[PDB]
Amino acid sequence: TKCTLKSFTVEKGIYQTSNFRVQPTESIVRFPNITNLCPFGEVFNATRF
Amino acid sequence: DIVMTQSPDSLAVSLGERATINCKSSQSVLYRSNNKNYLAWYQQKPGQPPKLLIYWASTRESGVPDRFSGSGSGTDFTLTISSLQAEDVAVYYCHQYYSTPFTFGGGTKV
Ligand SMILES: *[C@@H]1O[C@H](CO)[C@@H](O[C@@H]2O[C@H](CO)[C@@H](O)[C@H](O)[C@H]2NC(C)=O)[C@H](O)[C@H]1NC(C)=O
């Protein structure tokens, strides 16, 4: 509060100082179960362009 | 790669007639920037390295009479021999050159 009002003494009242936010406890990833690699070999590396 | 099915394999046909050998690879071995079908027809008499018959699977090269004729497109190709002669008891092959690795035919012992 002292830093919000920029004073070393504060007067009786209610002051809004900051914001509360719950924090993420975990990180999850969901991707499809596709498995086969991709045919980049026969696109970049091919005889006849 | 490009695995080729060449039919038939055991041509036993009398002299003078026509005959035809078709080829069917898994891939459509063709090109459109140059409408040239990268594929060739070869033949071989026993005892010698084979001899080139048709390039671009259609066009005739010098020293080739009408006893050979190349045609085809897509992934189906035909070598047509109009008349037979006594020197043509030989093994015929198809061969791709569209993309490595190169492959040959199964053979055709006419
Ligand atoms: C065709 O193109 C690929 C790139 O998509 C190249 O990958 C090579 O793989 C071999 C084996 O590890 C290594 O020489 C290098 O990882 C790559 N070669 C390089 C960077 O020159 C390669 O040119 C071709 N792929 C294969 C299996 O030959």
Curated annotation (Swiss-Prot), chain A:
Protein name in the entry: Spike protein S1
Assembly mode: Binds to host ACE2. RBD also interacts with the N-linked glycan on 'Asn-90' of ACE2. Cleavage of S generates a polybasic C-terminal sequence on S1 that binds to host Neuropilin-1 (NRP1) and Neuropilin-2 (NRP2) receptors. Interacts with host integrin alpha-5/beta-1 (ITGA5:ITGB1) and with ACE2 in complex with integrin alpha-5/beta-1 (ITGA5:ITGB1). May interact via cytoplasmic c-terminus with M protein. May interact (via N-terminus) with host bilirubin and biliverdin, thereby preventing antibody binding to the SARS-CoV-2 spike NTD via an allosteric mechanism.
Gene: S
Glycan attachment residues as annotated in the record: 25, 27, 33, 45
UniProt effect for mutating residue 41 to H: In strain: Omicron/BA.2.75, Omicron/XBB.1.5, Omicron/EG.5.1
Function, as annotated: Attaches the virion to the cell membrane by interacting with host receptor, initiating the infection. The major receptor is host ACE2. When S2/S2' has been cleaved, binding to the receptor triggers direct fusion at the cell membrane. When S2/S2' has not been cleaved, binding to the receptor results in internalization of the virus by endocytosis using host TFRC and GRM2 and leading to fusion of the virion membrane with the host endosomal membrane. Alternatively, may use NRP1/NRP2 and integrin as entry receptors.
Disordered: annotated segments: 21-37
Upper taxonomic lineage: Viruses, Riboviria, Orthornavirae, Pisuviricota, Pisoniviricetes
